[PDB]
Amino acid sequence: AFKHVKSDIKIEKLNVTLNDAAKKQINNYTSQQVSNKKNDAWRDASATEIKSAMDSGTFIDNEKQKYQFLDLSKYQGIDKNRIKCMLVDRPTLLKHTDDFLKAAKDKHVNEVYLISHALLETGAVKSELANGVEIDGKKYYNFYGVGALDKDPIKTGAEYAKKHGWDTPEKAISGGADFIHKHFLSSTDQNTLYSMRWNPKNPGEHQYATDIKWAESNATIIADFYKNMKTEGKYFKYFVYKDDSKHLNK
Ligand SMILES: [Cl-]
Ligand code: NA
């Protein structure tokens, strides 16, 4: 059955209106893009679209879009049997459920986000990184496509694994999680898809994507996974602009 979870929400109230945040956004970055109607056709995002994409006010109140605020650096403790639901069509990952969860706990990564990286990264040809690739005798594994260049995934992914001593699937799963934390969660101000994307606390500093819908799409995906498991997230950090009445106090 559906399992409700006691939410732990932090409300980051920003000392700027959404309007002023958009104004800072257009003046601090370049090449903000958005998809066309028929996808795989990027174009320039207008200011109105940028501002809409920045609207934490609409996202907070949305069932799926609130996941733009899920805290990706926090291990939740989701029942491992529920997690196996995400790994139905992925035997090799399914079997490592326990390893993914221990790595999520030890390296500080939300388990759904961690597995979604493994799921969406061992697909098609890349699955061979998860099964192991041989090299000069030993063998090496890569569960998140770390360092796997799109031109030559296996050689690069495997050589990266080799370079990092990932000679066991457990070492790759653990090491790979430490990589995800170090790379995507290295800043305390960018532990959510929303803050990763707009860096509202450090105007002008690194944003993780130029596609204005990057957080939206990735939140839909995480939300769907939780829904597929019949449960929900626990830790969230909402970003709220100073002109958002409906949430500035709450
Ligand atoms: Cl954050
Ligand atoms: Na600009």
Numbering used by the authors: 1 to 250
What's the paper's own text on this?
SagB crystallized with two and AtlA-gl with one molecule per asymmetric unit.
The structure of SagB is well-resolved based on electron density maps along the entire chain with the exception of the N36 to A41 region in both molecules, as indicated by the Ramachandran outliers and higher atomic B-values, as well as a few other side chains. The crystal structure also contains eight PEG molecules (PG4), two chloride ions and one sodium ion.
